[PDB]
Subunit: 258 residues, 3 copies
């Protein structure tokens, strides 16, 4: 019968587009905004200030928009922003981040965040990412587009997870993961690149070839990071996809996973 | 108090035996069937098409019968079947599986699926199994009778867990685990055989001895798998419990955990 | 707004201080006692016999006071006791323990038990401890004061975790961790001591020095545990912090994490 179930609790300051659905026993707290086409399941807790975009789905037992730990001071404004076409499965926890220092927690578009995954404060997820069951981002974690974190992947605070990268199940990531790289184990170790994912995306053969060579430059020829960046310079100018790889290594603050 | 709490939602398509109990704020969805003596706690989400048998117990915050990701086409029929005398603890997630290709998700009888454990699509659990807290079966996983997967055990798609086998806590299983074998670590490694389980089952002392010999044949004498199967043939003809072990090795598709 | 939400269920045997808050769709079961200033969120399940103290916060989807597995006999009395100023985040599970053999499950004061963490039967946690997300104590685990168990730390039954000790993310602890010791990995290995924590607690620089020397006596000088205890004796009599360390090694029942 009604799009907003009568058993849900909707705070008067929440703002919901006219077609939003909310299931029974869900709570949509103060300062939570929900855009067109989004479906909130039953037994969902939403807390704000939080903006959720269009055409999202949030499943049962999720807590989205929770308090950030250790604020600089009491009542520093925080925020969580979720874009469009995302799926947040059961039991997921997502915390807000601080606004003043531009460290909101942010999730882009077309992401899949699977059961019991955890998105810690100030983390930023791009587009078309997949965080499989029980993945946990500790805090201040940046996950660039098309990355796949397999089940039970744990990510240390401040780590960057490169575009189109891949972690194996149960991986424990302490350092940055360069774009395209595949990591496994606890502690995580680089193995290869996700050539599969490149093909599914339609990369040319020449760019794949140039990425395979780039992997060897960084990981298999005894170079220092500095020497590898200088050697990749030329290929990175020719192939935007190698520039993605090179740029991910240059902006690494915690060293790269090796 | 009524057996179906008045605050629970029971879909007009669901079919329940007359003595079934359902707690407050629980949803028994469309196309769910629940047999005699089952108790559903509070805050449970059941979705279908799902058959739950007799004398089961399903605890709070569990999502039992969720959607399979792996559909060939929109509305391909899918199903989850749970047998009798099972206990499904809090927070457990169980996905359905496809009917057409005989790949339904199936759980037999007398199983214990402990908190936050995850049973992915198309998986098949036998009888008298224990999946400890946070165990995850990614998909297409077969758990044979009496197996124990210790807490936080992660199992790769398509793996077979043999009868009476055991995994140590935090194990990450990528290959098949032969019957009776104990495995540990990330990545998992074979260590020994579950002699304790054998004695709790009543095995004769000759059969336990033959199984200890069989472990060494496969794992300690430098034999190939082909060589080991040939050498086990004789003992397997004498002892049904050694045939279990031999048969588990012969039907391995991902290699055996070593 | 009423302190006890009209949608919560409060068993007539439960005993609450007058100012206790209890959110919608929460169950305070039989034999649950709750003290002054404690706040129970929505969607919380409390079962007894369980005592919760003063100024505690228990978040959504938590099951606090659950049954102990395999009691000596049906209806052997069990209990869980939680002290004051504790925070129990979402999805946390805490089981009771047996009363007769002094094995209740007990939690002291000023503890932070983060999302989806698990406290198994007969476990004892002191004061000012942090169990990060998804930390799991299997059963009969003792956690001394100021310990920090990072996310996804798994603890085998009967282990003791010493005061001021630290585990890295994803650690799988199978033996005792001495006080102050930092451990990492699956299986866990000792790396150093938590000198940071000592500084934040205000230890004198002479006591930190004596603890650094004590670490080397146990771990870096080829001594047996017996030898090391004899050599530490003198410093332990002079510094109460080194006695903490020595006493944690002497009372180890599963060997120490090395
Ligand atoms: C189906 N493929 C796998 O399950 C491999 N995989 C990566 C992965 C997983 C799922 C997806 N998608 C789901 N909907 C769309 N995409 C994509 C890649 C794992 O993480 C395995 S571990 C694991 C897996 C599931 C639960 C618990 C655990 Cl531990
Ligand atoms: C009591 N034995 C253990 O706790 C050993 N165990 C195997 C095991 C565990 C339980 C059972 N049963 C429970 N009811 C009946 N059987 C049987 C074997 C583990 O998985 C340890 S780890 C762990 C354990 C519990 C929670 C989280 C974690 Cl991480
Ligand atoms: C901020 N520090 C860290 O996040 C480091 N940490 C220890 C730690 C963590 C939190 C706290 N507190 C929170 N409120 C007060 N204290 C203190 C120490 C981890 O366990 C990282 S792993 C992890 C972290 C969080 C979620 C999932 C995972 Cl997997
Ligand atoms: Cl909108
Ligand atoms: Cl999921
Ligand atoms: Cl956080
Ligand atoms: Cl993997
Ligand atoms: Cl790879
Ligand atoms: Cl692929
Ligand atoms: Cl792309
Ligand atoms: Cl039935
Ligand atoms: Cl679903
Ligand atoms: Cl459980
Ligand atoms: Cl699934
Ligand atoms: Cl073993
Ligand atoms: Cl009190
Ligand atoms: Cl009590
Ligand atoms: Cl006691
Ligand atoms: Cl938390
Ligand atoms: Cl327990
Ligand atoms: Cl760590
Ligand atoms: Cl350290
Ligand atoms: Cl320091
Ligand atoms: Cl102190
Ligand atoms: Cl020892």
């Amino acid at each position: 019968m009604s799009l907003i179930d009568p058993r849900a609790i909707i705070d008067p300051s929440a703002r919901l587009a006219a077609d939003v659905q909310v299931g029974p026993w869900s709570i949509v707290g103060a300062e939570v905004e929900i855009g067109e086409g989004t479906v909130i399941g039953p037994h969902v807790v939403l807390k704000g200030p939080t903006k959720i975009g269009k055409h999202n789905r949030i499943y049962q037992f999720s807590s989205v928009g929770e308090d950030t730990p250790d604020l600089k001071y009491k009542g520093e404004p925080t925020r969580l922003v979720i874009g469009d076409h995302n799926v947040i499965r059961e039991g997921v926890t997502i915390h807000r981040g601080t606004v003043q220092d531009r460290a909101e927690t942010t999730i882009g578009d077309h992401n899949l965040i699977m059961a019991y995954a955890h998105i810690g404060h100030d983390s930023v997820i791009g587009n078309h990412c997949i965080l499989v069951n029980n993945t946990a981002l500790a805090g201040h974690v940046h996950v660039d587009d098309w990355a796949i974190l397999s089940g039970y992947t744990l990510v240390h605070q401040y780590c960057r997870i490169g575009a189109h990268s891949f972690s194996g199940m149960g991986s424990a990531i302490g350092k940055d993961v360069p774009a395209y790289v595949t990591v496994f184990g606890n502690p995580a170790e680089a193995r290869s690149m996700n050539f599969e994912g490149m093909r599914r995306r339609g990369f040319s053969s020449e760019a794949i070839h140039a990425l395979r060579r780039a992997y060897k430059v960084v990981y298999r020829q005894g170079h220092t990071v500095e020497e590898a960046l200088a050697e990749l310079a030329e290929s990175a100018a020719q192939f935007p996809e190698v520039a993605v790889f090179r740029d991910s290594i240059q902006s690494a603050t915690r060293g790269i996973t090796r």
